[PDB]
Design a protein around this ligand. Structure first.
Ligand SMILES: CCCCCCCCCCCCCCCC(=O)O
Length: 133
């Protein structure tokens, strides 16, 4: 259940994230910030409404969405995208679309921690998050 993803999570490990950002076309300024920020990810749900808030000194982002409904997302790197979030096959899937390109971030609960995987054109990433308190 999506509720099982609720809570404040802290990043304990990252992998492939720098390759992904490169794949998107993000420059060093943001690539360095992302590569060195150890953000907190707060996920809360209300029925079908869902909010994902990212917090760090180097950056703070946040967006809300209703499962199954498309919406305009202003990504941390400045992209406006047509995002849809849908909880399917036991994971939260955040599919993005912009300028003919696509990308999807998948968040799932595993062994007690939140495992976030991002993919774009076969280039992927894997961030592990442990619940705070
Ligand atoms: C932290 C911001 C760094 C700037 C680069 C942002 C690149 C956009 C990344 C968007 C995808 C983020 C999803 C990664 C998964 C996660 O939430 O940790």
């Amino acid at each position: 259940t999506v509720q099982q993803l609720e809570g404040r999570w802290r990043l304990v490990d990252s992998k492939g994230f720098d390759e992904y950002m490169k794949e998107l076309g993000v420059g060093i300024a943001l690539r360095k910030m992302g590569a060195m920020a150890k953000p907190d990810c707060i996920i809360t749900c209300d029925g079908k409404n869902l909010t994902i808030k990212t917090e760090s000194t180097l950056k703070t982002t946040q967006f809300s969405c209703t499962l199954g409904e498309k919406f305009e997302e202003t990504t941390a790197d400045g992209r406006k995208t047509q995002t849809v979030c849908n909880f399917t096959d036991g994971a939260l899937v955040q599919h993005q679309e912009w300028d003919g390109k696509e990308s999807t971030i998948t968040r799932k609960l595993k062994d007690g921690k939140l495992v976030v995987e991002c993919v774009m054109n076969n280039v992927t990433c894997t961030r592990i998050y442990e619940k705070v308190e």
